Design a protein around this nucleic acid. Structure first.
Ligand code: MG
Ligand code: MG
Ligand code: MG
Ligand code: MG
Ligand code: MG
Ligand code: MG
Ligand code: MG
Ligand code: MG
Ligand code: MG
Ligand code: MG
Ligand code: MG
Ligand code: MG
Ligand code: MG
Ligand code: MG
Ligand code: MG
Ligand code: MG
Ligand code: MG
Ligand code: MG
Ligand code: MG
Ligand code: MG
Ligand code: MG
Ligand code: MG
Ligand code: MG
Ligand code: MG
Ligand code: ZN
Ligand code: ZN
Lengths: 25, 127, 214, 91, 97, 201, 97
RNA sequence: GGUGAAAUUCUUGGAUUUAUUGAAGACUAACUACUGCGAAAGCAUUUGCCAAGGACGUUUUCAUUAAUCAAGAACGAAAGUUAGGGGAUCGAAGAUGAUCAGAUACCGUCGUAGUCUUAACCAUAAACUAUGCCGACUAGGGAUCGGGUGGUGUUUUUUUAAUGACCCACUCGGCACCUUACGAGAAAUCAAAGUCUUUGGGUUCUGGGGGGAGUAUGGUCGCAAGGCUGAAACUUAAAGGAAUUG
């Protein structure tokens, strides 16, 4: 997949694990 | 020698206009468009049409009074193609060839000290 | 069941004074009825005629003129200055590659208090024996050409209205005093006035207006 | 000895009302409380007292101005545009 | 790799020019990379010139051509106009004709 | 209870030996001791009162009269003004745009005072607490606080009652509604989050 | 410029700063040119001017505040008026002023 | 009107075209180039003002005051964010007309944010010459930009000059191009990417098979979006470069 689109892929993916970890703070 | 008016032939793509007016402009005299004299949208600008409209247009010109007329030919312009349409020529061609006179004709296409961003975005019309 | 031409009142256009043919062309209106009359209604239109179509000789093929209709009388309507434009072809021709363009303008009044802004364009010329292939000025050249043009054009106006200014422009005296002052700075070719527009007329003055007539 | 990291005068509201609002109020409190240069006698001594009224410690001139600042941006352009149009009438 | 010292086209010592808009597709394209044509041509045309002076006032008139500067976007310049595509060597020759 | 400061301005009395004092809304930048000039043949400075007829378009005035001599009606709140946007000298009118955005055309004789009203910006500041609201209306009128009609019983309001809180019927009420009905969005010709720019054309 | 002439006066001449003393200057005819700041109120002004014409002293309206006139003369305070008594190497008295 | 063709759409509200004038905000056409300037980002209407700079000229002045740089700092395209203003244009989102097997797109329309500006954030681009800086040396040619020098050179007429623009030779310092290649490279190519197993002028920084992955974690910066710093387990025999023939 386009690099720019995978850079966005994981960009999201982080923002989600960011979310789930805050549930636990 | 003659009686005078202004021609003003707007020839874009998709259509070509022709209409003589009083050399002051404020007052019309006969119009008729490329679209008028054939029916199929796609052909609304072809020289074969612009002729038959310049046919009608010359007729009313010499039927009302104008014996002669200077032309101001013109493309879309502004932030668009800027280059003459197909039926500018044919029109001009077939309106002098109608027995009306010609005299001193310039190109009044609007041209800008550029800007107002053109349409269709930085990547162009891709098709 | 109409055809406005079976109803159009008709008319012929007369020009001012400082040219050749005072006769210009024809026009149409609408019969001066009670409630909406052919007089006051329009008239105040304008007409662009190449002055080579107005002065006779083609050493004037460019240079268009804007005439306005102010007063009217029995199938005869006079006209007075309203502007002067160049032509597209000449300009688009004058502007060649490989050379500097120089433009400058100024806003200024006259005696008979019309306000106008006149324009001016020149191009750097190769000197006859030049080996390099372009000829450009040194900016410092260009600012000094503008300043002179400016110093010149402000003198040329406020002389006896456009009236004289009209008589001034037609044989392009201005063009060459430019050429005069200039050549001490830089070569330069063409050099014209190109444009001049009107933006604030005085007052009608039926007397004065009638002076260009007879 | 820097007393607070970022609240400044806005300290008094402790924790209440939320950052955003406090941020806004801070901006204009600082505006409204500050000492200003006097257009007339020329000492920074215009302090406020009720929206719109700006008066001078000594020299005692009092000027109508903005609600929390001496001169509102608008009124200034309005000043200069009035300049312009008035120019048009002696010229 | 690389297949042009001029890279795209024409910019050494600038870092940024300014983009023009393609006359055909309206693609944005830096002025120096642009590809340009001076479309100088008669107002009339081929055949009309006779029937011009024929049904006219004036002697021969004068005649005033139309001039306008054309900018293409490569893809559009390639799709029609000046391009062809040239051999590894023909490429380097910048001479017009 | 006023956004904007007042300016006490005193005049001589044309007809009797004595001072007579007026209460002006202070335009921004007018100051104590400043000379104020009022009248047809008066100059275009901040603080003067001039008849809309005599000021070039683009002028910016305050406290302007709906009809000449009504002693001033339009734009008086801290921060507003009106803008002359042209005149028609026959039947001396003068077209202005008010704060609302509305254009209205009034007599040229209508006076207006050159400037904007002082105290602008007053509404940029969060009230923050209930008290500052409280103290605000304490000097206006008895309108605060505001019980949501939707929290009342039905005797009390069109919105009242229900086993959950809800308006229960369209809250856009007819212009032709009758007293005791008009509570909601009266005559609303649209509704919902205004998206897109506003600004009268 | 005028400030440049002024600071030459300062560093080679005799002056005096501020209201009360440039009145003593004016009474004794010692003053060669007084300099009045933009903002100093039109009574102070009108009066100095009156005093001035009575001793025939030419007056220079300094376009600029009392705050800058103070800087103009190199003092860290503000002056509403300066008075010249001796003009140093400077030509202030017999230039455009 | 728009397209490949169309349709959505607009049209007694005389559309589209014409004419006169007016308002708004953006922009800076042609002249514009293998041309200029700036540390880079970037910068193209006039005119005023404000300070700044290189090159050049120099029998001026100081006299080692410098080269490069962890830390730290200034600035930093586009977008994006805060609060105002502005909001013409074009236009992520959204909705539509079509196309299509489908078509969340390409194409057409409506158009929110945005696009401009002020105050403040953000700190990233193929931010590219994919090439660190200071110094030295090594090889031809014609252009050109700036500066300077030289000439009983040209053109400007007046009474010769003075000027100005031109021409020719030289010389500093620019932006590039040409041809060579003693030389270098895996090659493409390179006046540096040359003066390297005949390996040392001074200094900064980064890389050490591919994937895992710029992921986890900690710290830190940010309003946020995110920036900086930044692993391992495990997996794997090739990924990769340049050139050749198909
Ligand atoms: Mg929880
Ligand atoms: Mg490739
Ligand atoms: Mg390959
Ligand atoms: Mg770049
Ligand atoms: Mg109550
Ligand atoms: Mg409530
Ligand atoms: Mg409520
Ligand atoms: Mg209840
Ligand atoms: Mg009900
Ligand atoms: Mg009820
Ligand atoms: Mg209920
Ligand atoms: Mg509820
Ligand atoms: Mg330009
Ligand atoms: Mg540390
Ligand atoms: Mg660092
Ligand atoms: Mg917008
Ligand atoms: Mg969509
Ligand atoms: Mg669909
Ligand atoms: Mg979608
Ligand atoms: Mg990077
Ligand atoms: Mg590049
Ligand atoms: Mg060399
Ligand atoms: Mg010489
Ligand atoms: Mg294997
Ligand atoms: Zn004071
Ligand atoms: Zn294209």
């Amino acid at each position: 997949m386009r690099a720019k689109w995978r850079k966005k892929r994981t960009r999201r993916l982080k923002r989600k694990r960011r979310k789930v970890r805050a549930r636990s703070k | 020698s003659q009686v005078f008016g202004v021609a003003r032939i707007y020839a874009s793509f998709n259509d070509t206009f022709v209409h003589v007016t009083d050399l002051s402009g404020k007052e019309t005299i006969a119009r008729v468009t490329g679209g008028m004299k054939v029916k199929a949208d796609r052909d609304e600008s072809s020289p074969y049409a612009a002729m038959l409209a310049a046919q009608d247009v010359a007729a009313k010109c010499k039927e009302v009074g104008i014996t002669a007329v200077h032309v101001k030919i013109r493309a879309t312009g502004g932030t668009r193609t800027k280059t003459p349409g197909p039926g500018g020529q044919a029109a001009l061609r077939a309106l002098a060839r109608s027995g009306l006179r010609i005299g001193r004709i310039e190109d009044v296409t609007p041209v800008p000290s550029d800007s107002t961003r053109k349409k269709g975005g930085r990547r162009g019309r891709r098709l | 069941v109409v055809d406005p031409f079976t109803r159009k009142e008709w008319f012929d256009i007369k020009a001012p004074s400082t040219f050749e043919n005072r006769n210009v062309g024809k026009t149409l209106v609408n019969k001066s009825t009670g409630l909406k009359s052919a007089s006051d209604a329009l008239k105040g239109r304008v007409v662009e005629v190449c002055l080579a179509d107005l002065q006779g000789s083609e050493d004037h093929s460019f240079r268009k003129i804007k005439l306005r209709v102010d007063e009217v009388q029995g199938k005869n309507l006079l006209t007075n200055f309203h502007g002067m434009d160049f032509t597209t072809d000449k300009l688009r021709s004058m502007v060649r590659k490989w050379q500097t363009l120089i433009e400058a303008n100024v806003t200024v009044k006259t005696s008979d208090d019309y306000v106008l802004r006149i324009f001016a364009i020149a191009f750097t010329r190769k000197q006859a024996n030049q080996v390099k292939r372009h000829s450009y000025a040194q900016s410092s050249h260009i600012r000094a050409i503008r300043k002179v043009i400016s110093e010149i054009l402000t003198k040329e106006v406020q002389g006896s209205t456009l009236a004289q200014l009209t008589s001034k422009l037609i044989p392009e005296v201005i063009n060459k005093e430019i050429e005069n002052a200039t050549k001490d700075i830089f070569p330069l070719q063409n050099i014209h006035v190109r444009k001049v527009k009107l933006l604030k007329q005085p007052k009608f003055d039926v007397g004065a207006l009638m002076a260009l007539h007879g | 000895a820097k007393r607070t990291k970022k609240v400044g005068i806005t300290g008094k509201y402790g924790v209440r009302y939320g950052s955003s609002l406090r941020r806004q109020v801070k901006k204009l409190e600082i505006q409204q409380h500050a000492r200003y240069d006097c257009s007339f006698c020329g000492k920074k001594t215009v302090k406020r007292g009720a929206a719109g009224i700006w008066t001078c410690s000594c020299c005692k001139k009092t000027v109508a101005g903005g609600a929390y600042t001496v001169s509102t941006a608008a009124a200034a352009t309005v000043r200069s545009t009035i300049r312009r149009l008035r120019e048009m009438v002696e010229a | 790799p690389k297949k042009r010292a001029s890279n795209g086209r024409n910019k050494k010592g600038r870092g940024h020019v300014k983009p023009v808009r393609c006359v055909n597709c309206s693609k944005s394209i830096p002025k120096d990379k642009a590809i340009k044509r001076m479309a100088i041509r008669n107002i009339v045309e081929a055949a009309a010139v006779r029937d011009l002076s024929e049904a006219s006032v004036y002697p021969e008139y004068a005649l005033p051509k139309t001039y306008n500067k054309l900018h293409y976007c490569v893809s559009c310049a390639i799709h029609a106009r000046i391009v062809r595509v040239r051999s590894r060597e023909d490429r380097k020759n910048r001479a017009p004709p | 209870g006023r956004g904007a400061p007042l300016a006490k301005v005193v005049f001589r009395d044309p007809y009797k030996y004595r001072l007579r004092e007026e209460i002006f809304i202070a335009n921004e930048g007018v100051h104590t001791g400043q000379f104020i000039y009022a009248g047809k043949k008066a100059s275009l400075n901040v603080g003067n009162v001039l008849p809309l007829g005599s000021v070039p378009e683009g002028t910016i005035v305050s406290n302007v009269e709906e009809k000449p001599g009504d002693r001033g009606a339009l734009a008086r709140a801290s921060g507003n003004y009106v803008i002359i946007i042209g005149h028609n000298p026959d039947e001396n009118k003068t077209r202005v745009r008010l704060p609302s955005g509305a254009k209205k055309v009034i007599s040229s004789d209508a006076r207006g005072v050159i400037g904007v009203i002082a105290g602008g910006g007053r509404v940029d500041k969060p009230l923050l607490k209930a008290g500052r609201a409280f103290h605000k209306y304490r000097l206006k009128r008895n309108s605060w606080p505001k019980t949501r009609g939707v929290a009342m019983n039905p005797v009390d309001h069109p919105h009242g009652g229900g086993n959950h809180q809800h308006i229960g019927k369209a809250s856009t009420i007819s212009r032709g509604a009758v007293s005791g009905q008009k509570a909601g969005l009266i005559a609303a010709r649209r509704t919902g989050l205004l998206r897109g720019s506003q600004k009268t054309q | 410029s005028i400030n440049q002439k002024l600071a030459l006066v300062i560093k080679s001449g005799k002056y005096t700063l501020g209201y009360k003393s440039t009145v003593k200057s004016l009474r004794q005819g010692k003053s060669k040119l007084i300099i009045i700041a933009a903002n100093t109120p039109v009574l102070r002004k009108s009066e100095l001017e009156y005093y001035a014409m009575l001793s025939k002293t030419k007056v220079y309206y300094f376009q600029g505040g009392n705050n800058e006139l103070g800087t103009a003369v190199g003092k860290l305070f503000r002056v509403g008026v300066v008075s010249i008594l001796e003009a140093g190497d400077s030509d202030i008295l017999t230039t455009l002023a």
